[PDB]
Amino acid sequence: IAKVQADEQFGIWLDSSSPEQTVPYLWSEETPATPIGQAIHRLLLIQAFRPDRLLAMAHMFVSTNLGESFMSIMEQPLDLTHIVGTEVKPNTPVLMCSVPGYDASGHVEDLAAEQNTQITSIAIGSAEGFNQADKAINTAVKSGRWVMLK
């Protein structure tokens, strides 16, 4: 409280677009804090002062603790080609859940075209689609082809 009152430059920071980047020194410590200590203290300060920048301050904290490029891969587009080529077992289904109001079939069709792999598009909602999917699974489980269930 005393440091807030005494700090003239507090208002500019508090009414700034990105206060989390330049949170001022407002805490007292006996020995200089480690970078992770500074990150966590600035996280507390941001949560108390500007909770709308809490997400950005948590991003900065996690970048300090785990490396800056820790989430950078998530920003990149899905590398479904590699994720299907390796790291997935053939008996493991690929549950590509999509939020309501979206379709993920285009990604799989594009991947199959890119890899030149035969893909069997099937709509599960059909009662005959049940048996068609069963037959396609039975055939492809030995033929080595990809099966699409929608």
Partner 1 sequence: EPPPGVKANMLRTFSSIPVSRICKSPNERARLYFLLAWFHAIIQERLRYAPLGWSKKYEFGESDLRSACDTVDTWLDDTAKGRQNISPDKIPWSALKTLMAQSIYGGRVDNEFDQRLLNTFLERLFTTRSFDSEFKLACKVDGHKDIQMPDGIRREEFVQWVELLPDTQTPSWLGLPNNAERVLLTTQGVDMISKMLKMQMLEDEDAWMRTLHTTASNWLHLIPQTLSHLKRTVENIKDPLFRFFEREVKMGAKLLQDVRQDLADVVQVCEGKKKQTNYLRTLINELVKGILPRSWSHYTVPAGMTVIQWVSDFSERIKQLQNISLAAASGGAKELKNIHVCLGGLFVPEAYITATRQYVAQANSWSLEELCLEVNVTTSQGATLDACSFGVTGLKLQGATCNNNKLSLSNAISTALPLTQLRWVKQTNTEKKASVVTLPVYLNFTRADLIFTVDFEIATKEDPRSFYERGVAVLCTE
Partner 2 sequence: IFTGSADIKHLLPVETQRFQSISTEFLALMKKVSKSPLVMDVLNIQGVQRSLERLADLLGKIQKALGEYLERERSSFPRFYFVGDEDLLEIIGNSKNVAKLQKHFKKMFAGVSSIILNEDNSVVLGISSREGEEVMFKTPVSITEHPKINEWLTLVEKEMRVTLAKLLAESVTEVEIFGKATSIDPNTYITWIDKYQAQLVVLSAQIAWSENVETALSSMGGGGDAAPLHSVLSNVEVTLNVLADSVLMEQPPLRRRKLEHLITELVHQRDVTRSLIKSKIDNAKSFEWLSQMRFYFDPKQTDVLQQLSIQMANAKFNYGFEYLGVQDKLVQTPLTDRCYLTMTQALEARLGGSPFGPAGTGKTESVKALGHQLGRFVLVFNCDETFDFQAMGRIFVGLCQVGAWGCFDEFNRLEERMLSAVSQQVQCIQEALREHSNPNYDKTSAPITCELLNKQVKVSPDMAIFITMNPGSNLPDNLKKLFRSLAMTKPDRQLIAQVMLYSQGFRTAEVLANKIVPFFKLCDEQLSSQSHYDFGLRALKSVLVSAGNVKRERIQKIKREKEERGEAVDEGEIAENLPEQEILIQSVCETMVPKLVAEDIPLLFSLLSDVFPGVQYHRGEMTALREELKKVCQEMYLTYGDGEEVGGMWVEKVLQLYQITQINHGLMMVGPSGSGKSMAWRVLLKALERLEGVEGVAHIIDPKAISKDHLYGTLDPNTREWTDGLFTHVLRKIIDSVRGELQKRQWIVFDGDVDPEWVENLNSVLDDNKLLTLPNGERLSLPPNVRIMFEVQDLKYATLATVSRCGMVWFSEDVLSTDMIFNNFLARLRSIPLDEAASPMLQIQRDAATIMQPYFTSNGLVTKALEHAFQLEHIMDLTRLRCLGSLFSMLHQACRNVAQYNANHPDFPMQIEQLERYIQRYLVYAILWSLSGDSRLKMRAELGEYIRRITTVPLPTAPNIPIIDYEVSISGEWSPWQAKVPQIEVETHKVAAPDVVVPTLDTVRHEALLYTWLAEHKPLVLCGPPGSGKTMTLFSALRALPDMEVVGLNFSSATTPELLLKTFDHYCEYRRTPNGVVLAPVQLGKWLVLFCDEINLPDMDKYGTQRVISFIRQMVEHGGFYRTSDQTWVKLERIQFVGACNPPTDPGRKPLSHRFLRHVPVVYVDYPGPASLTQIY
Q: Which does 99 bind (CB under 5 to 8 A by kind): partner 2, partner 1, none?
A: partner 1
Distance CA 102, CA 91 (A): 26
Task: Kindly tell me which residue out of 98, 115, 131, 138 binds partner 1, with binding defined by CB under 8 A.
Answer: 98
CB of 50 to partner 1, least distance (A): 9
Which pair of tokens denotes residue 107? Answer: 């990604």
Task: Kindly tell me which residue out of 16, 21, 29, 51 binds partner 1, with binding defined by CB under 8 A.
Answer: 51
Q: Measuring CA to CA, how many Å separate 132 from each of 8, 54, 113, 120, 127? A: 73, 51, 22, 10, 9
Binding segment toward partner 1, per CB under 8 A, in 7-15, 64-72, 96-104, 131-139? 96-104
> What's the one-letter identity of residue 54?
L
